[PDB]
Design an enzyme around this catalytic site. Structure first.
Site, PDB file in Angstrom:
ATOM      1  N   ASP A  37      10.022   7.125  -4.823  1.00  0.00           N
ATOM      2  CA  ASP A  37       9.888   8.174  -3.836  1.00  0.00           C
ATOM      3  C   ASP A  37      10.045   7.858  -2.361  1.00  0.00           C
ATOM      4  O   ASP A  37      10.894   8.436  -1.692  1.00  0.00           O
ATOM      5  CB  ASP A  37       8.563   8.902  -4.000  1.00  0.00           C
ATOM      6  CG  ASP A  37       8.458  10.108  -3.078  1.00  0.00           C
ATOM      7  OD1 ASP A  37       9.254  11.059  -3.240  1.00  0.00           O
ATOM      8  OD2 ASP A  37       7.586  10.093  -2.187  1.00  0.00           O
ATOM      9  N   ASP A  72       6.957   3.537  -1.332  1.00  0.00           N
ATOM     10  CA  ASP A  72       6.211   3.096  -2.508  1.00  0.00           C
ATOM     11  C   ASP A  72       7.082   3.002  -3.756  1.00  0.00           C
ATOM     12  O   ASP A  72       8.308   3.086  -3.673  1.00  0.00           O
ATOM     13  CB  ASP A  72       5.057   4.076  -2.748  1.00  0.00           C
ATOM     14  CG  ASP A  72       5.544   5.489  -3.015  1.00  0.00           C
ATOM     15  OD1 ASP A  72       6.720   5.792  -2.709  1.00  0.00           O
ATOM     16  OD2 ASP A  72       4.748   6.301  -3.521  1.00  0.00           O
ATOM     17  N   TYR A 122      -0.483  13.683  -3.400  1.00  0.00           N
ATOM     18  CA  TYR A 122       0.833  13.270  -2.934  1.00  0.00           C
ATOM     19  C   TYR A 122       1.819  14.413  -2.934  1.00  0.00           C
ATOM     20  O   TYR A 122       2.378  14.754  -1.890  1.00  0.00           O
ATOM     21  CB  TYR A 122       1.369  12.121  -3.796  1.00  0.00           C
ATOM     22  CG  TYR A 122       0.362  11.003  -3.893  1.00  0.00           C
ATOM     23  CD1 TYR A 122      -0.450  10.864  -5.016  1.00  0.00           C
ATOM     24  CD2 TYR A 122       0.145  10.147  -2.812  1.00  0.00           C
ATOM     25  CE1 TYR A 122      -1.465   9.899  -5.056  1.00  0.00           C
ATOM     26  CE2 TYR A 122      -0.862   9.190  -2.846  1.00  0.00           C
ATOM     27  CZ  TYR A 122      -1.664   9.073  -3.964  1.00  0.00           C
ATOM     28  OH  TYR A 122      -2.679   8.144  -3.980  1.00  0.00           O
ATOM     29  N   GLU A 165       7.388   6.478   7.952  1.00  0.00           N
ATOM     30  CA  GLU A 165       7.707   6.160   6.565  1.00  0.00           C
ATOM     31  C   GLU A 165       9.115   6.715   6.337  1.00  0.00           C
ATOM     32  O   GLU A 165       9.658   7.428   7.181  1.00  0.00           O
ATOM     33  CB  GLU A 165       6.718   6.784   5.562  1.00  0.00           C
ATOM     34  CG  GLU A 165       6.950   6.242   4.133  1.00  0.00           C
ATOM     35  CD  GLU A 165       5.776   6.447   3.176  1.00  0.00           C
ATOM     36  OE1 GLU A 165       4.741   7.009   3.585  1.00  0.00           O
ATOM     37  OE2 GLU A 165       5.898   6.027   2.001  1.00  0.00           O
TER      38      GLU A 165
HETATM   39  O1  LIG Z   1       2.717  27.368   6.086  1.00  0.00           O
HETATM   40  C1  LIG Z   1       2.421  26.082   5.568  1.00  0.00           C
HETATM   41  C2  LIG Z   1       3.506  25.604   4.619  1.00  0.00           C
HETATM   42  O2  LIG Z   1       2.937  24.514   3.855  1.00  0.00           O
HETATM   43  C3  LIG Z   1       3.875  23.918   2.944  1.00  0.00           C
HETATM   44  O3  LIG Z   1       3.233  22.893   2.267  1.00  0.00           O
HETATM   45  C4  LIG Z   1       3.127  21.644   2.973  1.00  0.00           C
HETATM   46  C5  LIG Z   1       1.673  21.165   2.971  1.00  0.00           C
HETATM   47  O4  LIG Z   1       0.875  22.062   3.731  1.00  0.00           O
HETATM   48  C6  LIG Z   1       1.562  19.754   3.565  1.00  0.00           C
HETATM   49  O5  LIG Z   1       0.239  19.270   3.374  1.00  0.00           O
HETATM   50  C7  LIG Z   1       2.570  18.791   2.907  1.00  0.00           C
HETATM   51  O6  LIG Z   1       2.579  17.582   3.600  1.00  0.00           O
HETATM   52  C8  LIG Z   1       3.122  16.424   2.920  1.00  0.00           C
HETATM   53  C9  LIG Z   1       4.621  16.265   3.220  1.00  0.00           C
HETATM   54  O7  LIG Z   1       5.354  17.401   2.799  1.00  0.00           O
HETATM   55  C10 LIG Z   1       5.102  15.049   2.456  1.00  0.00           C
HETATM   56  O8  LIG Z   1       6.507  14.902   2.568  1.00  0.00           O
HETATM   57  C11 LIG Z   1       4.391  13.838   3.026  1.00  0.00           C
HETATM   58  O9  LIG Z   1       4.844  12.707   2.369  1.00  0.00           O
HETATM   59  O10 LIG Z   1       2.972  13.956   2.796  1.00  0.00           O
HETATM   60  C12 LIG Z   1       2.380  15.152   3.382  1.00  0.00           C
HETATM   61  C13 LIG Z   1       0.919  15.169   2.965  1.00  0.00           C
HETATM   62  O11 LIG Z   1       0.244  14.002   3.409  1.00  0.00           O
HETATM   63  O12 LIG Z   1       3.894  19.338   2.985  1.00  0.00           O
HETATM   64  C14 LIG Z   1       4.026  20.603   2.305  1.00  0.00           C
HETATM   65  C15 LIG Z   1       5.495  20.988   2.369  1.00  0.00           C
HETATM   66  O13 LIG Z   1       5.946  21.078   3.715  1.00  0.00           O
HETATM   67  C16 LIG Z   1       4.368  24.953   1.940  1.00  0.00           C
HETATM   68  O14 LIG Z   1       5.320  24.354   1.077  1.00  0.00           O
HETATM   69  C17 LIG Z   1       5.008  26.128   2.672  1.00  0.00           C
HETATM   70  O15 LIG Z   1       5.384  27.121   1.728  1.00  0.00           O
HETATM   71  C18 LIG Z   1       4.012  26.713   3.680  1.00  0.00           C
HETATM   72  O16 LIG Z   1       4.643  27.741   4.434  1.00  0.00           O
HETATM   73  O1  LIG Z   2      -0.506   8.631   1.245  1.00  0.00           O
HETATM   74  C1  LIG Z   2      -0.126   8.159   2.534  1.00  0.00           C
HETATM   75  C2  LIG Z   2       0.652   6.853   2.437  1.00  0.00           C
HETATM   76  O2  LIG Z   2      -0.225   5.874   1.838  1.00  0.00           O
HETATM   77  C3  LIG Z   2       0.350   4.558   1.834  1.00  0.00           C
HETATM   78  O3  LIG Z   2      -0.560   3.694   1.241  1.00  0.00           O
HETATM   79  C4  LIG Z   2      -1.715   3.343   2.025  1.00  0.00           C
HETATM   80  C5  LIG Z   2      -2.968   3.982   1.412  1.00  0.00           C
HETATM   81  O4  LIG Z   2      -2.876   5.395   1.500  1.00  0.00           O
HETATM   82  C6  LIG Z   2      -4.220   3.502   2.155  1.00  0.00           C
HETATM   83  O5  LIG Z   2      -5.384   4.013   1.518  1.00  0.00           O
HETATM   84  C7  LIG Z   2      -4.253   1.970   2.150  1.00  0.00           C
HETATM   85  O6  LIG Z   2      -5.354   1.522   2.861  1.00  0.00           O
HETATM   86  O7  LIG Z   2      -3.069   1.451   2.776  1.00  0.00           O
HETATM   87  C8  LIG Z   2      -1.864   1.811   2.060  1.00  0.00           C
HETATM   88  C9  LIG Z   2      -0.704   1.140   2.774  1.00  0.00           C
HETATM   89  O8  LIG Z   2      -0.565   1.644   4.096  1.00  0.00           O
HETATM   90  C10 LIG Z   2       1.656   4.538   1.029  1.00  0.00           C
HETATM   91  O9  LIG Z   2       2.269   3.268   1.182  1.00  0.00           O
HETATM   92  C11 LIG Z   2       2.626   5.630   1.511  1.00  0.00           C
HETATM   93  O10 LIG Z   2       3.727   5.724   0.615  1.00  0.00           O
HETATM   94  C12 LIG Z   2       1.922   6.982   1.590  1.00  0.00           C
HETATM   95  O11 LIG Z   2       2.802   7.940   2.157  1.00  0.00           O
HETATM   96 MG   LIG Z   3       3.409   9.686   0.959  1.00  0.00          MG
END
Ligand SMILES: OC[C@H]1O[C@@H](O[C@H]2[C@H](O)[C@@H](O)[C@H](O[C@H]3[C@H](O)[C@@H](O)[C@H](O)O[C@@H]3CO)O[C@@H]2CO)[C@H](O)[C@@H](O)[C@@H]1O
Ligand SMILES: OC[C@H]1O[C@@H](O[C@H]2[C@H](O)[C@@H](O)[C@H](O)O[C@@H]2CO)[C@H](O)[C@@H](O)[C@@H]1O
Ligand SMILES: [Mg+2]
Ligand SMILES: [Ca+2]
Ligand SMILES: [Ca+2]
Ligand SMILES: [Mg+2]
Ligand SMILES: [Mg+2]
Ligand SMILES: [Mg+2]
Length: 611
Positions: free
Chosen positions: A52, A55, A201, A417
């Site tokens: 993804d 990670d 996640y 990231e």
């Molecule tokens: O109006 C709010 C919109 O929210 C959308 O969902 C988002 C979540 O609120 C948000 O927490 C999440 O964040 C993720 C991010 O997308 C992800 O790529 C990243 O790695 O981690 C974040 C969390 O730590 O994102 C989603 C999507 O943007 C709804 O999808 C949307 O319909 C709504 O309008």
């Molecule tokens: O979920 C956010 C982010 O986490 C990253 O791992 C972190 C973990 O969340 C934290 O608890 C620990 O202390 O450190 C690790 C490394 O920074 C992870 O690598 C990301 O992919 C993820 O987006």
């Molecule tokens: Mg993440």
């Protein structure tokens, strides 16, 4: 900016995210087989797909969103891919993801939506090739549904079918067969209640959008209007803007919300005003603003939606704006507005602020993206080494804050990231900019890196000494990175000149070798062996074969061995000074890298010198 090169690198980014049995045709020397036991817990081959982000979890919702978006780009702009010569590469990527989704649907009605556990996976900082933790598989079925992830995968498979049909009609049919099964699962259930392994996640906040998105792509792949009718039927169920009965328009296309792409496509397919109005409201909110509302913009021009992955959102909307602006149905006056937006957002990502946010591209590109395998730590430390051992070309970092603030640090996963979904829409927008402004990609581009640190080394020091013996403390270190790998066939040799033993009338082979300490249960220290007797050179062979030495921890990457060679007690002719491996040897138990106690990997010398 050179858009062709950016396009080329954005596509390449995915090759570095690949999990599984890698192709012999790969164009890098730092990624190798990994996640090779994926699915072993359920008896299904689930190898392949893409990791993804920074990670190694395989999260099928964003993964399928990504491949669906890449296929959408190829569908819209095949001419850009052909002209840039990148067609083979993006198709290979799309097939890489979809071959994995097919494996994830082993029997009708069953879908594995994840391999790996976020908690366990993220607790370790090291290269994908040597992961030691359990990687559980998770599935949805009729009793435990995952409509969003099943439909997102159906959309990926169906969109792949559309773009592969001309050159590989059989694979197109294969994709359609599986897309149909997954969509049926999603449509029957209308629930994400069984989709729980991605909690924290990629938990899903909507699935009706995914149902429409998947149905649209299945319509384009099969031409069966049954799917178009379904696509339209879910629209009333899409989320609305608060206190309004208006289809949501203040967010953007992303892994969790694909109604933006679905409505854009429905507008082109049906020309109905509802869809045209809906997508233009979204695009207007992102550009000119609409009804007194407008997405925030940073002082330097970035349409800023959210703290996490700001560039991901802006560049994805840039792609949708480009697609829609090219459609004859777009309000004429907005064509230029939307095209200007596409360029401004992509240019911000590429370098309009003075630096690039794309790894390995442009001026002052990010050097410390939050990515385990590109960094290549061999000690389970985000802080060591202090630089990334590899260049993960094409990766678009999260992006700056609302004031253009950005800190390129490895620990900054909110803004630094890199991930599959981050590069998805970006790739499509780049294809459009290339079509319009050009920029030649690098011919025959590959990522064969120069090895920047000795992959396997040895450090030694004088442990104990005496008038009749020398005791060595040696530590072998696995610092592999091209690719990171287990080194289970390592050995080293300690050379001595035993002319003084021969002169004492003693058999050099009778000297006593021993070891009072050693890490690793397989560590074997030999007795004295001949090497070049004409010059009285003998050696001690220390074999570490069988040891699971790997670059994933301070203890994991090293094996300490203490060994002694001794002449008879009471004797005084032992002379370590004429011994090849004793020269320069650290006078104490505190070791330092040495080059005269050569290290071998499967019998081949890889570090140090021999006499
Ligand atoms: O109006 C709010 C919109 O929210 C959308 O969902 C988002 C979540 O609120 C948000 O927490 C999440 O964040 C993720 C991010 O997308 C992800 O790529 C990243 O790695 O981690 C974040 C969390 O730590 O994102 C989603 C999507 O943007 C709804 O999808 C949307 O319909 C709504 O309008
Ligand atoms: O979920 C956010 C982010 O986490 C990253 O791992 C972190 C973990 O969340 C934290 O608890 C620990 O202390 O450190 C690790 C490394 O920074 C992870 O690598 C990301 O992919 C993820 O987006
Ligand atoms: Mg993440
Ligand atoms: Ca959704
Ligand atoms: Ca000697
Ligand atoms: Mg192979
Ligand atoms: Mg630095
Ligand atoms: Mg000599």
């Amino acid at each position: 900016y050179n858009y062709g090169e950016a396009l080329q690198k954005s596509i390449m980014f995915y090759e570095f995210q690949r999990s599984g049995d890698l192709p012999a045709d790969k164009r890098d020397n730092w990624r190798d087989d990994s996640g090779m036991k994926d699915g072993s817990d359920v008896g299904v081959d689930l190898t392949g797909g893409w990791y993804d982000a920074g990670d190694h979890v395989k999260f099928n919702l964003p993964m399928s969103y990504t491949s669906a978006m890449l296929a959408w780009s190829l569908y819209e702009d095949k001419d850009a891919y052909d002209k840039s010569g990148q067609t083979k590469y993006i198709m290979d990527g799309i097939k890489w993801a979809n071959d994995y989704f097919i494996k994830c649907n082993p029997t009708p009605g069953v879908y594995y939506y994840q391999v790996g556990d976020g908690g366990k996976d993220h607790s370790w900082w090291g290269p994908a090739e040597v992961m030691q933790m359990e990687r559980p598989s998770f599935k949805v079925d009729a009793s435990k549904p995952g409509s969003a992830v099943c439909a997102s995968t159906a959309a990926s498979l169906a969109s792949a079918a559309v773009v592969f049909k001309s050159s590989d009609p059989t694979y197109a049919e294969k994709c359609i067969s599986h897309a149909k099964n997954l969509f049926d699962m999603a449509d029957k259930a209308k629930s994400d209640a069984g989709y729980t392994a991605a909690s924290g996640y990629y938990s899903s906040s909507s699935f009706y959008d995914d149902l429409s998105w998947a149905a649209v792509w299945l319509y384009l792949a099969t031409n069966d209007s049954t799917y178009l009718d379904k696509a339209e039927s879910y629209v009333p169920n899409w989320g609305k803007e608060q206190q309004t009965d208006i289809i949501a328009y203040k967010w953007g296309q992303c892994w969790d919300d694909v109604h933006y792409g679905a409505e854009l496509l429905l507008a082109k397919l049906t020309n109905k005003q509802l869809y045209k109005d809906s997508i233009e409201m979204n695009l207007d909110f992102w550009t000119t603003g609409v009804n007194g509302t407008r997405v925030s913009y940073t002082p330097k021009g970035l349409a800023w939606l959210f703290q996490w992955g700001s560039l991901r959102h802006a560049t994805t909307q840039a792609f949708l704006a480009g697609v829609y602006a090219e459609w004859e149905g777009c309000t004429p006056s907005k064509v230029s507005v939307y095209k200007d937006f596409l360029k401004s957002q992509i240019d911000y990502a590429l370098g309009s602020t003075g630096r690039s946010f794309v790894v390995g591209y442009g001026v002052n590109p990010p050097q410390h993206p939050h990515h385990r395998t590109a960094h290549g730590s061999w000690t389970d430390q985000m802080t060591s080494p202090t630089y990334h051992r590899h260049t993960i070309y094409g990766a678009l970092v999260g992006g700056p804050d609302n004031a253009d603030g950005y800190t390129d640090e490895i620990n900054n996963y909110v803004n630094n990231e890199i991930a599959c979904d981050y590069n998805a829409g970006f790739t499509g927008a780049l294809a459009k900019m290339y079509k319009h402004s050009g920029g030649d990609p690098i011919p025959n581009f590959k990522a064969i890196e120069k090895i920047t640190n000795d992959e396997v080394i040895i450090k030694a020091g004088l442990n104990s000494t005496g008038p009749n013996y020398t005791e060595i403390k040696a530590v072998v270190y696995n610092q592999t990175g091209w690719p990171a790998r287990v080194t289970d066939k390592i050995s080293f040799k300690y050379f001595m000149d035993l002319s003084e033993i021969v002169a004492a009338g003693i058999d050099p082979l009778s000297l006593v070798t021993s070891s009072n300490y050693s890490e690793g249960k397989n560590t074997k220290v030999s007795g004295v062996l001949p090497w070049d007797v004409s010059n009285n050179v003998y050696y001690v062979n220390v074999d570490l074969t069988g040891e699971n030495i790997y670059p994933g921890g301070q203890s994991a990457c090293r094996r300490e061995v203490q060994f002694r060679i001794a002449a008879p007690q009471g004797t005084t002719y032992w002379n370590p000074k004429n011994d090849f491996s004793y020269d320069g040897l650290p006078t104490t138990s505190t070791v330092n890298t040495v080059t005269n106690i050569p290290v071998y990997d499967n019998g081949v010398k890889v570090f140090g010198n021999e006499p």
